[PDB]
Design an enzyme around this catalytic site. Sequence first.
Site, PDB file in Angstrom:
ATOM      1  N   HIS A   1       0.777  -1.131   0.092  1.00 49.50           N
ATOM      2  CA  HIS A   1      -0.102   0.097   0.028  1.00 49.50           C
ATOM      3  C   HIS A   1       0.914   1.343  -0.003  1.00 49.50           C
ATOM      4  CE1 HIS A   1       0.104  -0.388   4.438  1.00 49.50           C
ATOM      5  NE2 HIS A   1       0.032   1.070   4.486  1.00 49.50           N
TER       6      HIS A   1
ATOM      7  N   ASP B   1       1.497  -7.906   2.658  1.00 50.38           N
ATOM      8  CA  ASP B   1       1.435  -6.269   2.343  1.00 50.38           C
ATOM      9  C   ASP B   1       3.000  -5.800   2.326  1.00 50.38           C
ATOM     10  OD1 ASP B   1       0.943  -3.528   1.950  1.00 50.38           O
ATOM     11  OD2 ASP B   1      -0.450  -3.597   3.723  1.00 50.38           O
TER      12      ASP B   1
ATOM     13  N   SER C   1       3.495   2.430   8.447  1.00 52.60           N
ATOM     14  CA  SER C   1       3.344   1.521   7.406  1.00 52.60           C
ATOM     15  C   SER C   1       4.641   1.222   6.919  1.00 52.60           C
ATOM     16  CB  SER C   1       2.626   2.170   6.385  1.00 52.60           C
ATOM     17  OG  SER C   1       1.182   1.888   6.813  1.00 52.60           O
TER      18      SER C   1
END
Lengths: 697, 695
Positions: free
Chosen positions: B63, B205, B630
Amino acid sequence: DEGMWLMQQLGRKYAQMKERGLKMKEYDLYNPNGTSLKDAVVLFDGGCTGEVVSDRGLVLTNHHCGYDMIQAHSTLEHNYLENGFWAMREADELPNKDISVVFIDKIEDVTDYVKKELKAIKDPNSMDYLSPKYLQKLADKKAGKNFSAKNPGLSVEIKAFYGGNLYLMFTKKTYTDVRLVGAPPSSIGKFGADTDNWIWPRHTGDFSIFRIYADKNGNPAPYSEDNVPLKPKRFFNISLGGVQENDYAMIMGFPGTTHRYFTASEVDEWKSIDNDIRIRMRDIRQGVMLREMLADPQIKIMYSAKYAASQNAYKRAIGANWAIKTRGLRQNKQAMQDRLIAWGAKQGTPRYEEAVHEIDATVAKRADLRRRYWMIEEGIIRGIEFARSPIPTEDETKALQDASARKEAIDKIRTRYSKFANKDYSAEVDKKVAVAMLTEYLKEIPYENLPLHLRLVKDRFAGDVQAYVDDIFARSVFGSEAQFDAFAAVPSVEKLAEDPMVLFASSVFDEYRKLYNELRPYDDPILRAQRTYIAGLLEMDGDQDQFPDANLTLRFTYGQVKGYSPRDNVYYGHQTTLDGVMEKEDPDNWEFVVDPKLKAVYERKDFGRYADRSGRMPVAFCATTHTTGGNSGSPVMNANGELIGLNFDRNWEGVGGDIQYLADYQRSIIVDIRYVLLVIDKVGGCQRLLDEMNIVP
Amino acid sequence: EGMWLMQQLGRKYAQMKERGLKMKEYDLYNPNGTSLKDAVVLFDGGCTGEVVSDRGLVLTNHHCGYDMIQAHSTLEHNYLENGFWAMREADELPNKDISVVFIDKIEDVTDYVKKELKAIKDPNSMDYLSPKYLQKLADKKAGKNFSAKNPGLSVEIKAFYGGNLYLMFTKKTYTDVRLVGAPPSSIGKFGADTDNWIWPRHTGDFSIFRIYADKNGNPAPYSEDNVPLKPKRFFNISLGGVQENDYAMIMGFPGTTHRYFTASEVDEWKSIDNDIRIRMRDIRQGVMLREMLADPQIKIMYSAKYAASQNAYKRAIGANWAIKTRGLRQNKQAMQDRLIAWGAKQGTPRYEEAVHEIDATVAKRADLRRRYWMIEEGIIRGIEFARSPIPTEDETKALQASARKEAIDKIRTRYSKFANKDYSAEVDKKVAVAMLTEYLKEIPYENLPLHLRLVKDRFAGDVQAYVDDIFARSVFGSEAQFDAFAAVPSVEKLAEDPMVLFASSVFDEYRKLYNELRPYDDPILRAQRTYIAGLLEMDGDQDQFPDANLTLRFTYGQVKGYSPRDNVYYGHQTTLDGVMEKEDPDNWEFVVDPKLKAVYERKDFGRYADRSGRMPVAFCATTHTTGGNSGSPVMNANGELIGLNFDRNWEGVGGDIQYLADYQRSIIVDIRYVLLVIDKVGGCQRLLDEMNIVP
Ligand SMILES: CC1(C)CN(C(=O)NCC2CC2)C1(C)C
Ligand SMILES: CC1(C)CN(C(=O)NCC2CC2)C1(C)C
Ligand SMILES: [Cl-]
Ligand SMILES: [Cl-]
Ligand SMILES: [Cl-]
């Protein structure tokens, strides 16, 4: 697999039960020639299980089992369904019309007797070996002339087991004066409501309390103000020791039906026809219903119960199909039949392989008919409300063609119209549901297999389902109240004969009955082949780890208090607590409202001797016992035979357990007896019920 | 429990060692030498990344690299849905507007900044938090021309602890960062929006980039002559896996926290910010979802808009759950009451006065803040026709030179962007009717944007009629209405246009509310400097971490699951079996890559599976992370890479105000699953060979 065992099978299971933790003597649990714990178990109101918990006939069952009696005694002034009911004296206990409790007085193996009587074979294809009428004739013959008169309150019944390979005679004692004693408010009795149906973890206090009444001699008697509470032969002691992970647990009850001896072809049929059609059709029906309920709060009020009623077997079918897809049910039935076939070939007896072949052939032959039957039943009979709209009878039609009999026929038709188009009926919602349901039905069922009136969709309405449905309501006498009244003022036979709604309802019911009549003969070759199939399975592997299918008779099951992993990285433990009820509280959602007296008990930790050793208040637990519908209200026992809970549900992951027990997923969902006693004590304040029970530390 | 400054490693080291840390302090962070800190980057201004080879290979989330994967995707080579695996360094794709930032040096400059601030004069000056003022001090300390003497380098000073501590960062920025590898979106975004903020989690991810530089390893913009960077430090990859209770640590760039909120600020966050966002977005999402389910073409046009609204909606639900059940307000009240009792004892009343100023400012701005959130959630983001074209002063002074056509072409371009391929006027009218009905019930007539007064005055309270009239009479109501206007344009048509008047009116009120509310932030910030100074003087800087501010922090904890509710336990690790359980071929979010499904069926797990033979996917830890973390590297007790942080469970979102030991977890993709995907899905062996993989 795990088993719903006959009481007769206790002897040969006893050593395994003892090795798994059972401490009580065999004959204290079940003795064919004396008093045992089996004598404290009842069939509650023809479906549920119950249990006697005092020397004055007090009975515990589920709240959902006593729901109708709590509702029938509820008014706006005394709403017992909403607030609970607690009779503070025996004289305050409420009688119930049409209630019963059945004790299983004696159980006898009558196999040799029934098999000798059956040898008087006029037709080898006779279904008398499974006929309740034939078996009742044998039961009366064995019991004697005027047994009912000679023994008032008693009755005899013979049932087939193992597909007709074993027969038992039951001597039953029935009491019909069973009074409502206590019930928690619905906020406790049905806490999860429909959201938590088939769900573990579970936080529902699913119990209600009744009392058996009898004449001065403890003999069955209908309701009479002179009736006295029954002093029973045996009652359960209540344990306050609680449960721990891996504890031995056992249940006695009346499981209704299982399909443990299905062939692989029957598993495929159950999945591809029964379950896939019910899933697909109910999802279409529920989807339209939910959209309409969410858009109009008045539609939500009228359709909530109909929506909830459809969802119950919808969820069951989803759970059953999950087991077929992931737990190898078809494969394990195939291995079972292949093992019998190989053994039959070595014994030089081909009749077992011939029996499995007959079952496969019958299943394959009825496929299209069964698909058409489930399609019309799920799609129209259940799916569309105007399918159950009024159809004028032959006598009603004759009455309309010269006497005062016309006004009598119109009044009967009006009563049925008013029941169809009641306060909960929306013609607009029904038209939207019918359009979606018929669109799917018309895509599956070819023109030549359609109920005659549905042929008009293609022939008269150019395939426009909406126009066909609009026309049914615009032109029908049952399309609205004003259209019914115009008909009722000037009624003619010729108006009813051409009525689009009457023709639709008549046509779909004609096709539904024609399919049923054509399908019914296929059950008999399967049943006859199952008698040979199950005889082979029993001769080959013994009646030791192959239990007979449930048939609404008394059975026992044993296991352990144990949670399970529903999916990757998720574990559900064996016990829920009052903290879980508080976590779920939602004041503006009727399903998750918490009783203020219960919330206060939690806040003050007023748990008395009912809390576990860590001070946490238990609510429910789950166990590896093998249960099904009919086991609601069943007593759950300790290794010592003491009552530790009442069974009230099973998790959706284990619903495939009716065909194949699932050791790693299937659990009985049980209300902890400590939570039951906490609610009677701190919510109901009904101390006299606690005092009459024998509570052991 | 905290997001610690690199300077605080010395003071935390003994606790980290007692919790399991095995590496030497200066191997993790060295203020004057190479350390593991040198392998951590700020990836593209938001995310965290990490260098994993001596040739500048960087791992981050899928992402985080999503925009670069999408920008290089076409119908012929759809890397977003297929994945991308450059089989040679020359095949790696350059990205415009990308950057990676290394934190070269960090210095405490508190005494310096505080001495410079003494020459301000105005006691209420906000220069102590001004990036412009602090940059002037950073340049003054670095030198006349620091960036010229040290190319690729830059300096920055940031305030910490509400202005009680200042750090200067020397940053090295690289702008040639090339796309090397990415799994398909079915792996990189497996849960998609359904599993956002969810544990258990089965999402792989990750995405792979490479830093490029000039021949001397110095920062350089994209050039075909650029060579991969040889970094001073890179992470070794561990294949030893994780076990329950294992020590884990993260370095990254958490963006924001509110650890020093007063009890009144917690109440405000709940009753205004969260309740309004929850109520307004539930109305908006409900109408949008009904329309998407009834029309498959509406589902295509509105899926991304629906998903974008749901993300902060779910965050607000999780935050309100913590306020309701975890005692956030009560714990802030106990914190401030303890400071007040200590200040009363020392004869220093300024701390109690600071908490009182915060409470008074919160109470005073309540109605304004409620009106601002109501218009922002209800109209500014709630109704698409609020962002319809508003003619500029230049465009009006053209329709009444012959640049009337130039004005129309600019208005047309903006109309075409508003009424694009994903815009449904019918869906927008239905959303506007439900949103305005709620807005009109909550905002009194005298507080309404001027045009909304017409609902009661002209349309007799009929919201539907008001909204129907906006589209029926507006030049932006349809393409045919715009074209009729564009053929015969007048300023008098635009001046009375119902859509222009609505859009202008709601934006006027939104800006007026913002301007009136902005002055209330300053007395709170000034009182927080005194409040946090007192908390630090009383209990010390060692349990009380400084609020996150997009700067490098470390956090430590253990690999551990949690109980989300009564009788339910979520373990510390998910497996490939959980991906297969979730497979739904006719749901785009839960489709499983056929190469991955085959790997699972054949158990072709190589050296990546655990000792049981089960293939791990993700794990969770008690580290304290937030937005900005992240892509953060997750380290072993030995400093070896064991995973990448990619999310946090919804139960822990209240952790930005109060860390929740029993619920809050960082959601991390297991490095073994990353290597299994590169190897068995991508077949990109060269990436495995260039990494230092330790057994
Ligand atoms: C897994 C099940 C068999 C149970 N179920 C439900 O719909 N239960 C509703 C609960 C609230 C979410 C199916 C999905 C059909
Ligand atoms: C409290 C929740 C877990 C419920 N929720 C959502 O709004 N939707 C996510 C649901 C799973 C599809 C969170 C805030 C994540
Ligand atoms: Cl034979
Ligand atoms: Cl299983
Ligand atoms: Cl470097």
